[PDB]
Amino acid sequence: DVSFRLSGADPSSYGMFIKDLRNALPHTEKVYNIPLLLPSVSGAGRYLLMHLFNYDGNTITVAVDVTNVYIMGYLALTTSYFFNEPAADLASQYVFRSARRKITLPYSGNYERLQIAAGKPREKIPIGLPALDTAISTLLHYDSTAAAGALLVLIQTTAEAARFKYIEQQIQERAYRDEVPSSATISLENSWSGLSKQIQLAQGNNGVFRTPTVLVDSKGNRVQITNVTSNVVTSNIQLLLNTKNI
Ligand SMILES: *[C@@H]1O[C@H](CO)[C@@H](O)[C@H](O)[C@H]1NC(C)=O
């Protein structure tokens, strides 16, 4: 398991949580010096647990699939909540067994279905550490509409930061003031599956991507990514989704 506490958090302690989350995901090889996530894991070993706490100290446990860094569901006191999707239903076989009742949320866990339930897209939802406190507070008591927005905040501030060093840095600057996500942030989140696949293909192709990936940079401008020498590969992406899962 891994943990993070909003009470007393600063850029350094959040960076430490993100390093832990990364090191909890298993791999048997690296590809261009970057961990390759597993094709598959059987049983309960498939799921990682994250314990998160708000400023007031109240908590949820979030179950994460280690092959792909997807959130399956979470436990809030005695009620489990799972996304309405087969991977989550399978997960509900293995995690939060204890719960008194199991609510299936009235949406799956992809960004597009979440944004619809929330009533706004994530470019308009401020993120940061204060926003993560608010998210944890909302998920504590079921309100399916409020929960969708909170889930959008949680996914980005955890799984997305683990995937990209830049996204982790962005949350760090928002340690004490929320701000909607930078354009580069939304771009990387959207490109993770693509980048993972292109990096894997590059082995056997002299480090060259079979298909280039379009992104937004730190200054708000486009870049196009063509090979492994790019700083997105050398100095940003931290985890690769196995092509067996794409
Ligand atoms: C590869 O990467 C860098 C961009 O980081 C670029 O300057 C270079 O021209 C690219 N070369 C090839 C052969 O793909």
TrEMBL record:
N-acetyl-alpha-D-glucosamine binds at I71, Y111, R163. The gene is RIP. UTP binds at V69, I71, Y111, E160, R163. It is an enzyme of class 3 (hydrolase). CDP binds at Y70, I71, E85, N110, Y111, E112, R163. Its EC number is 3.2.2.22. It comes from Momordica balsamina (Bitter gourd). Beta-D-fructose binds at G109, Y111, R163. GMP binds at Y70, I71, E85, Y111. It catalyses: Endohydrolysis of the N-glycosidic bond at one specific adenosine on the 28S rRNA. One of its GO terms (molecular function) is rRNA N-glycosylase activity. This is rRNA N-glycosylase. Guanine binds at I71, G109, E160, R163. UDP binds at V69, Y111, R163. Adenine 2 binds at I71, G109. Adenine 1 binds at Y70, I71, G109. It comes from the Eukaryota. Signal peptide: none annotated. Keywords: Hydrolase, Nucleotide-binding, Plant defense, Protein synthesis inhibitor, Toxin. L-ascorbate binds at I71, G109, Y111. It holds the Pfam family RIP. CMP binds at Y70, I71, E85, Y111, E112, R163. InterPro entries: Ribosome-inact_prot_sf (IPR036041), Ribosome_inactivat_1/2 (IPR017989), Ribosome_inactivat_prot (IPR001574), Ribosome_inactivat_prot_CS (IPR017988), Ribosome_inactivat_prot_sub1 (IPR016138), Ribosome_inactivat_prot_sub2 (IPR016139). CTP binds at Y70, I71, E85, N110, Y111, E112, R122, E160, R163. Glycans are attached at N227. One of its GO terms (biological process) is defense response. Belongs to the ribosome-inactivating protein family. Type 1 RIP subfamily. Cytidine binds at Y70, I71, E85, Y111, E160, R163.
